[PDB]
């Protein structure tokens, strides 16, 4: 079709958390969209299903269910693979619609002992563990990379339970997120006057208005419309942060799809005015 | 009681960062520094960290050698 | 110690003060008006 | 607990029917299209796809009430072209222009980095 | 003893014959929805399953309630009972096949209440006949009642937790007869003092007044998408007020679509603008700021609480009288659905910004604080010297107290006025007391340039302790600060005596509440 | 089957099985409690 | 049983001599919060006729300053009849004049 | 006086006044006058000097102590009575500014002014920018809002408890909380809020509030409740027993499940219970045999008057405790746990009495953000500050902005030099702000930005004891008074 | 109708009748049938009231006196 | 023996006075409660002032 742009990309900076990019001669909706998939619609494999067996900490059991819940997974390996448990064929549970995590620990010393995700292992091939000291020793130490500590126990007190982690997505429930955050900026000189700055002097200029390096403080241009987006991407550390977006992408591309054969559908039978 | 995994506000996960925090300060007092060094560049997850309190300590304090 | 008569500078910075109202509090209780009546 | 089951926000019931169109009445070459169990996600870029093409005299789009996840697309073109074939090629030129996205941008990754591994 | 169980409150006659609990109630919460119409109400689908309503059976509809019965109760859009015209009640639970159980035409079914069934719905104190209104329900998720955000006002809502009850009519007569007269269209104009009863208000009354300025100019794109909310609409596209350089509508244009194309409206104009009676008429630069209406389409000026609200001459009211209570009823809905999204692109806030003003201001503002604690000294060295000469009506010591008043309240006006005048276009602070949304005039002076003279019993400051008001004053000092005048501004903070002495003022105003609400429940009771 | 009734503050179990009295023997406390059951109950994260 | 009856019904006397004189002295000790427990530790009452009274013993007069706290009084009802002290304050136990 | 000051005479139990135009002097040693410690200042100087705040100091290894200090005769206890007397100053800054001012006389001096307040009118910051109905408000409000209350809770079992998860201390302080622990044991939580219209959920004294922030844990709660059930001997032929009722036997027949509970007569740490589970099986052998006559069969010997939950939907059984009371009876408590999420209709407040219900939530993809993405995890509507008229609101808000970005707690005592609009604004600006808080905020359905800049950042907010599920209710037939025939009371 | 402490089940004879409390309805198990003359332990309903002021209870109408260790009250 | 008398929490007649934080926290009883109030029938029971 005609109208169709022809949506360009560049990649200023990439890290092992960070995704830096410029997307030009695309759409302000495409824009918003691809950004609101980065949080709601991008799959994750996360703990869903906590049983546990024996509970002695100084802290109540739904609220351990909930830490776990909150700690992401190393999903490198192609969510894919792995289907909803909804539509697998199984009863309730299995291998293939599941990851399976486990905790048992207790504090024989007499010093405090800290409970972390090195302790929780994945009953299923190391694949898919939780993100603390896995991949790397990584030589920019997090003192004791211990992810997050679960709960603390002491002498006597023990805690012993099961995890089943599943895939789901960010508009169900924060847990299924892969990004810690997103920016995303427009037209950063304020050309546009989409907003109305008074006193325009007081404003800080942000990282992307250096173009004009100029005190003078936003040209006006009326006959412009939006065009080269910033964003910046921080992964959570559960998946890399290219790999969300080209998932998103992809993700939104089947969502689409998926609509358009219901629309076909629709007209499969009856014409429905199609012309 | 005990530090929540993930800034409420964000995302970014905030347990992996705690004792750290803590052990820094007690070795070097520049807690604006200090939270920098950790990695927290934004004031949500600052509060975050900064505006804690670990409480499960004075719960591990009881006698409850037992439960 | 102190000499009322060595001492040049008296003054001092009111935001001082709160050492002496800490004081207060960490010795009295914060509700002692209970405490004090039943055991008089 | 009054509140739904989270997945109910997004989830198709067994009963239920993805798309309805229905006609208009007050005025000639005009449809109102009505997307259950969706959001301002798909909603917002569709109707901006719709805008775009200079065949569409109106197109627009609302949810009713943020509690039921429902939609409404309301498209209306020349009297010589259908809304249902604009609406067809609005989103097939959506998904070929994210997919040009989708293939600059791998390529544009691969292009001086190593660790894109 | 038996009299005293008949006597009064809680007594068989008063506490009980003459008002009774009953059944069929409701009660939760309330939560402002925009995106219900007026006459409309959400229902928790737990409150909804749980209360009932009797259809009897007709050859015509057994169908559909023979599949409610088949739903049975355990899923929400069921029924709880059937009743046989024998006289048998059967519960839809114990019941193994409910499929055996086969209706009839005389058979009652209690179903559950669904989505358009009509309730009153009520909240106590009920001060006068509109604040118990019949509302159609609309079942929704999480457990409150939802209700349109216009509806606050006959109900003195304030959605700060404030409770609603609600009852359910359970015959067709009992609801043929709330359908006709207690409905809340129906209820719009007051028979108290002929006005509407309720008008709109919060941020659809501040986002209305900012949408009306003939500044705005909405895209082709922003148009059709307050197009898309509205519901009445023709199907034709207004001719934008601007057609090049590029297409563009005003925004009095599109709000002429959102009133039934037939009300007359002309005055109502009334901002504090333009000018106090003759200064527009001095040659007559049209009005920036006067409303006109005609042939159901706003000419010029800007909406406020003038036109736009419960004033008795309003659009809302006008169009009343001249539609009728269904057209008012859709305009009421599109009114604010329309306002509510185009404020939605356009933001409304309030930080300290709109509470600051400029260096040069406070120069002044203190400049005549000093010039109004002269003169009162003046006073005082005028008084000591007994040369003060009395006023014709008063001794010598309520003159000096009236004069003193009269200089520190002029000081207050004077530095307010400079203040509000001192203000620019942009501050959020004006845009909500001049649409009439929150606050008046002498809010803004109060934040911003000065505080003033506080009160209680209608004079300053009492002497607790003997001849002063608090340890920290001299004796026998008439002056302002330590009479309890405030000379800062809640944005500077207050000094301890102030704190203190507007801390005796706040009080008044919270014993004078708790007493009201006893004596005017009494004198209304004796009334009826 | 035994009832266990962990004891007040030493938490050897008490196997109260019958009517005896609940007090604990060896340790003089007399508060008790149930313990947790063998059964099992299911937590979603969320 | 005399005073463990008075502390526990709230009860004044040992019911011979009445009881209404000296209503609601005793209290559950309300604990929501840590901040709700030091404030009822810290409550200061106001007898009252029972209904209505509405006179000066009910404001704030001048001489509160630094005994009993500006602004804390019950939204409704007793609405200036329940105070509560500052922070400093303090109450003399008394002391044989001799 | 002098005496006083010296010790000879029993300093906090007895004040001494002159009333000199009437030539008398009342001195009073009773019990229950009301007295405060103040400064004597003396030859138009302060008594206390800087070597006792250096020997203050010292006390960490000292024994030094406040006794010491009023001891040192700096410090005296006034009453009112003798309050009524005294030339009070308000700040020794007064007292060095007399050389022009009016007053040349003082005799004792304020500590500090913000001692004027009470508990909880001292958790409140800014207070005096607040306009003064606002604080008795919040006072009211601070009682309800749940908190962790003491630390030993899980020992505890407290007949209605409320315990939050996450409290933390308020990012911006006042003084006087220092010596409340308020900071070892907070209220509520420091939230991202928003002054904005938004979509307007939140008119009228409401909220729109973040979804995945609920989710995160946000202002998450727990809600214990414990039932207490007593066996009894209670009369000559009447027996109480805790059992496993049944219908074969007991008379109550209540046709809520007696399954769950143990053999014993009451349920095990652990289990589900709802709206209808039978908590504890209590009954009362009561006839015995007087019935006469083989009235036996079934449901005779004995009637059911076990505990039920009537009360709501509830949650988890926590704990069971099986001891014995004062009578020495055996008796129990049962204690049930369940977790309160913030869901449309509860209620909340910020420090300034700003209290408000939640008008509905979104998910982190609707929440309007800013530059790096800072979602609002709370949005007020803007029309509650001016006609209520909290700034303080506003400045407990921008101060606390300034203490996410420093990292520094700040500092919101009510009286201080701290020219706080000017000064904070202007440490704002330098950590690379509007110097006023705005920030050029986005929309969240359309990604465009919001023409006007939202006042955004954080302040503490508390969560209410009065939670929605709570306070709903209905009815449809049900129980009738037959001393009355009329319903029940709710 | 002096036969039935609660065997008034018309269409067959009863085994046990069951009480749905919160219904305020009688009802019988193995076919439909409310026959529902109220008793929700009628006993209740004195103690209905509690949030309206009380303590010293003036609502109150009658005393426990104790009457299982006298023989007259 | 003439009778028995409650005693106000943590008063100087309250056994919890002579002990330490650490003892306190061993005895199971918060050592940041406040005390100064009666205990009776299993409630705390404080008297207004
Ligand atoms: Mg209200
Ligand atoms: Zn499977
Ligand atoms: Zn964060
Ligand atoms: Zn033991
Ligand atoms: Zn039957």
């Given at each position: 079709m005609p109208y169709a742009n022809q949506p360009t990309v560049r990649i200023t900076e990439l890290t092992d958390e960070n995704v830096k990019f410029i997307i030009e001669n695309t759409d302000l909706a495409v824009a918003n969209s691809i950004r609101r998939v980065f949080i709601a619609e991008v799959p994750i494999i996360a703990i869903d299903w906590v049983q546990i067996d024996a509970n002695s900490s100084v802290l109540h059991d739904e609220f351990i269910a909930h830490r776990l819940g909150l700690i992401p997974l190393i999903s490198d390996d192609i969510v894919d693979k792995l289907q909803y448990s909804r539509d697998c064929t199984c009863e309730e549970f299995c291998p293939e619609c599941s990851v399976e995590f486990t905790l048992d620990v207790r504090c024989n010393e007499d010093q405090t002992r800290h409970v972390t995700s090195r302790d929780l292992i994945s009953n299923s091939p190391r694949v898919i563990p939780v993100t603390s000291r896995n991949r790397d020793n990584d030589p920019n130490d997090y003192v004791e990379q211990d992810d997050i500590l679960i709960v603390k126990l002491r002498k006597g007190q023990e805690l012993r339970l099961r995890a089943y982690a599943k895939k789901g997505f960010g508009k169900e429930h924060a847990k299924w997120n892969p990004t810690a955050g997103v920016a995303f900026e427009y037209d950063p000189d304020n050309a546009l006057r989409h907003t109305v700055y008074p006193k325009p002097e007081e404003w800080p200029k942000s990282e992307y208005s250096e173009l004009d390096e100029d005190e003078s403080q936003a040209p006006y241009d009326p006959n412009g419309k939006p065009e080269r987006f910033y964003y910046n991407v921080e992964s959570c550390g559960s998946l890399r942060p290219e790999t969300i977006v080209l998932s998103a992408l992809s993700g939104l591309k089947k969502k689409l799809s998926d609509l358009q054969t219901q629309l076909s559908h629709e007209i499969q039978s009856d014409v429905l005015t199609i012309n | 009681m005990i530090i929540p995994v993930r800034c409420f506000t964000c995302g970014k996960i905030v347990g992996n960062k705690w004792e750290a925090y803590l052990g820094l300060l007690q070795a070097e007092y520049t807690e604006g520094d200090a939270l920098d060094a950790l990695g927290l560049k934004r004031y949500c997850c600052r509060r975050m960290l900064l505006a804690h309190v670990d409480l499960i300590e004075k719960l591990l304090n009881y006698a409850p050698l037992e439960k | 110690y102190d000499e009322d008569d060595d001492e040049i500078t008296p003054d001092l910075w009111q935001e001082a003060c709160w050492i002496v109202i800490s004081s207060y509090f960490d010795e009295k209780g914060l509700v002692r008006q209970q405490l004090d009546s039943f055991d008089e | 607990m009054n509140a739904p089951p989270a997945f109910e926000s997004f989830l198709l019931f067994e009963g239920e029917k993805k798309i309805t169109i229905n006609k208009d009445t007050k005025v000639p070459n005009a449809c109102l299209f009505t997307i259950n169990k969706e959001d301002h996600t798909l909603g917002n870029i569709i109707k901006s796809q719709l805008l775009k093409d200079p065949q569409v005299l109106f197109a627009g789009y609302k949810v009713p009430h943020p509690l039921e996840h429902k939609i409404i697309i309301r498209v209306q073109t020349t009297p010589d072209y259908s809304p249902q074939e604009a609406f067809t090629n609005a989103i097939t030129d959506l998904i070929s222009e994210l997919s040009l996205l989708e293939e600059r941008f791998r390529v544009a990754i691969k292009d001086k980095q190593e660790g894109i591994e | 003893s038996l009299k005293q169980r008949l006597?009064?409150?809680?007594?068989?006659?008063?506490?009980?014959?003459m008002g009774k609990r009953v059944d069929f109630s409701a009660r939760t919460v309330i939560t402002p929805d925009p995106?219900?119409?007026?006459?409309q109400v959400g229902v928790p689908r737990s409150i909804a399953a749980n209360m009932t309503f009797a259809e009897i059976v007709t050859p015509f509809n057994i169908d559909r309630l023979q599949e409610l019965v088949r739903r049975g109760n355990s899923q929400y859009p069921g029924a709880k009972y059937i009743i046989r015209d024998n006289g048998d009640r059967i519960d839809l639970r114990f019941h193994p096949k409910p499929s055996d159980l086969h209706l009839q035409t005389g058979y009652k079914v209690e179903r559950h209440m669904c989505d358009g069934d009509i309730v009153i719905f009520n909240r106590q104190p009920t001060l006068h006949k509109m604040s118990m209104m019949g509302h159609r329900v609309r079942i929704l998720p999480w457990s409150t009642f939802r209700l349109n955000l216009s509806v606050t006002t006959p109900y003195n809502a304030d959605f700060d937790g404030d409770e609603m009850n609600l009852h359910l009519p359970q015959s067709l007569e009992t609801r043929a007869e709330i359908q006709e007269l207690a409905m809340v269209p129906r209820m719009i104009v007051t028979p108290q003092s002929n006005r509407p009863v309720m008008g709109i208000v919060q941020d659809t009354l501040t986002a209305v007044r900012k949408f009306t300025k003939r500044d705005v100019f909405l895209e082709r794109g922003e148009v059709m998408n307050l197009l898309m909310f509205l519901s009445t609409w023709d199907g034709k596209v207004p001719q934008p007020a601007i057609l090049k350089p590029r297409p563009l509508w005003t925004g009095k244009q599109i709000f002429?679509?959102?009133?039934?194309?037939?009300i007359n409206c002309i005055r109502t104009h009334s901002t504090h603008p333009d000018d106090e009676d003759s200064g527009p008429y001095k040659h007559i630069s049209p009005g920036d700021t006067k409303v006109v209406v005609e042939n159901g389409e706003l000419i010029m000026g800007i909406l406020c609480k003038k036109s736009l609200g419960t004033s008795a001459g309003s659009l809302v009211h006008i169009s009343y009288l001249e539609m009728g209570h269904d057209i008012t009823r859709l305009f009421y809905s599109n009114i604010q659905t329309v306002i509510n999204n185009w404020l939605l692109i356009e933001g409304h806030t309030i930080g300290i910004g709109d509470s600051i003003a400029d260096s040069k201001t406070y120069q002044d503002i203190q400049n005549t604080i000093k010039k109004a604690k002269q003169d009162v000294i003046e006073v005082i060295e005028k008084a000591h010297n007994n040369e003060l000469e009395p006023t014709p009506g008063n001794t010598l010591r309520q003159t000096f107290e009236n004069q003193v008043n009269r200089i520190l309240n002029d000081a207050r006006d004077k530095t307010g006025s400079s203040a509000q005048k001192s203000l620019s276009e942009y501050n959020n602070f004006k845009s909500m007391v001049v649409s009439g949304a929150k606050g008046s005039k002498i809010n803004i002076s109060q934040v911003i340039a000065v505080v003033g003279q506080q009160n209680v019993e209608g004079k300053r400051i009492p002497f607790g302790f003997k001849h002063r008001t608090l340890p920290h004053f001299i004796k026998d000092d008439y002056g302002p600060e330590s009479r309890g005048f405030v000379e800062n501004s809640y944005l500077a903070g207050l000094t301890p005596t102030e704190f203190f002495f507007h801390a005796m003022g706040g009080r008044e105003g919270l014993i004078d509440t708790a007493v009201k609400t006893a004596e005017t429940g009494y004198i209304q009771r004796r009334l009826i | 089957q035994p009832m266990i009734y962990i004891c007040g503050e030493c938490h050897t179990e008490n196997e109260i099985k019958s009517r005896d009295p609940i007090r604990c023997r060896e340790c003089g406390y007399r508060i008790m409690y149930k313990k947790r059951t063998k059964r099992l109950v299911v937590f979603d994260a969320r | 049983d005399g005073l463990k009856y008075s502390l526990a019904t709230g009860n004044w006397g040992d019911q011979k001599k009445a009881h209404?004189?000296?209503?609601?002295?005793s209290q559950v000790l309300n604990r929501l919060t840590f901040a709700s427990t030091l404030s009822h530790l810290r409550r200061l009452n106001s007898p009252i006729g029972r209904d209505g009274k509405l006179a000066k013993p009910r404001q704030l007069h001048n001489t509160l300053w630094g005994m009993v706290c500006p602004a804390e009084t019950p939204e409704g009802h007793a609405v200036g009849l329940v105070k509560n002290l500052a922070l400093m304050a303090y109450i003399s136990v008394g002391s044989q004049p001799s | 006086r002098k005496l006083r000051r010296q010790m000879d005479i029993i300093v906090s139990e007895v004040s001494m006044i002159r009333d000199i135009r009437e030539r008398e002097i009342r001195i009073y040693t009773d019990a229950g006058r009301i007295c405060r410690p103040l400064l004597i200042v003396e030859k138009q100087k302060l008594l206390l000097k800087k070597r006792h705040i250096d020997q203050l100091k010292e006390r960490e290894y000292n024994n030094y102590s406040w006794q010491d200090l009023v001891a040192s005769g700096v410090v005296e206890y006034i009453d009112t009575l003798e309050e009524e007397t005294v030339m009070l100053a308000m700040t020794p800054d007064d007292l060095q500014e007399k050389e022009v001012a009016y007053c040349s006389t003082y005799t004792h001096c304020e500590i500090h002014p913000s001692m004027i307040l009470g508990v909880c009118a001292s958790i409140i910051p800014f207070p005096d920018h607040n306009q003064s109905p606002r604080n008795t408000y919040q006072s009211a409000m601070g009682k309800q809002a749940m908190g962790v209350y003491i630390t030993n809770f899980h020992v505890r079992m407290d007949t209605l408890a409320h315990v939050l998860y996450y409290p933390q201390k308020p990012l911006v302080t006042t003084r006087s909380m220092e010596y409340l622990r308020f900071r070892e044991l907070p209220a509520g939580i420091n939230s991202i809020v928003a002054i904005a219209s938004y979509t307007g959920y939140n008119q009228e004294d409401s909220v729109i509030m973040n979804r995945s922030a609920v989710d995160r844990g946000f202002f998450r709660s727990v809600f214990y409740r414990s039932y207490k059930e007593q066996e009894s001997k209670k009369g000559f032929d009447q027996e109480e027993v805790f059992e496993k009722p049944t219908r074969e036997t007991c008379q109550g027949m209540r046709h809520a499940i007696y399954d769950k509970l143990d053999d014993d007569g009451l349920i095990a740490p652990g289990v589900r219970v709802s709206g209808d589970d039978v908590i504890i099986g209590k009954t009362v052998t009561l006839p015995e045999n007087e019935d006469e006559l083989e009235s036996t069969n079934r449901r005779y010997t004995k009637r059911d008057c076990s505990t039920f939950l009537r009360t709501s939907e509830t949650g988890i059984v926590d704990q069971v405790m099986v001891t014995l009371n004062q009578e020495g009876y055996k008796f129990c408590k049962i204690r049930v746990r369940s977790v309160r999420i913030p869901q449309i209709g509860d209620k909340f407040a910020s420090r300034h009495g700003q209290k408000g219900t939640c008008g509905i939530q979104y998910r982190q993809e609707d929440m309007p953000f800013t530059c790096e993405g800072i979602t609002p995890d709370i949005i007020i509507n803007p029309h509650a500050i001016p006609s209520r008229m909290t700034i303080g609101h506003l400045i407990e808000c921008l101060q606390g902005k300034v203490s996410a970005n420093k990292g520094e707690i700040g500092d919101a005592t009510p009286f201080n030099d701290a020219v706080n609009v000017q000064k904070i604004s202007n440490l704002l600006s330098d950590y690379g702000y509007h110097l006023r808080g705005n920030e050029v905020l986005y929309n969240g359905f359309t990604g465009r930005k919001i023409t006007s800049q939202i006042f955004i950042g954080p302040t503490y907010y508390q969560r209410l004891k009065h939670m929605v599920d709570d306070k709903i209710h209905s009815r449809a037939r049900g129980p009738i008074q037959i001393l009355n025939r009329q319903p029940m009371e709710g | 109708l002096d036969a039935l402490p609660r065997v008034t089940c018309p269409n067959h004879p009863d085994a046990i009748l069951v009480e749905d409390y919160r219904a305020g309805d009688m009802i019988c198990p193995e076919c439909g049938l409310v026959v529902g003359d109220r008793v929700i332990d009628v006993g209740s309903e004195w103690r209905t009231f509690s949030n309206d002021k009380a303590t010293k209870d003036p609502s109150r109408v009658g005393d426990s006196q104790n009457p299982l260790l006298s023989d007259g009250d | 023996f003439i009778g028995k008398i409650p005693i106000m929490l943590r008063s100087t007649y309250c056994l919890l006075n002579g002990l330490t934080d650490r003892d306190l926290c061993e005895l199971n009883e918060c050592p940041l409660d406040p005390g100064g109030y009666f205990i009776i029938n299993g409630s705390e029971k404080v008297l207004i002032a």
């Open positions: - | - | - | - | 006597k009064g409150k809680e007594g068989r006659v008063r506490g009980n014959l995106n219900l119409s007026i006459d002429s679509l959102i009133i039934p194309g037939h | - | 209404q004189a000296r209503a609601g002295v | - | - | -």
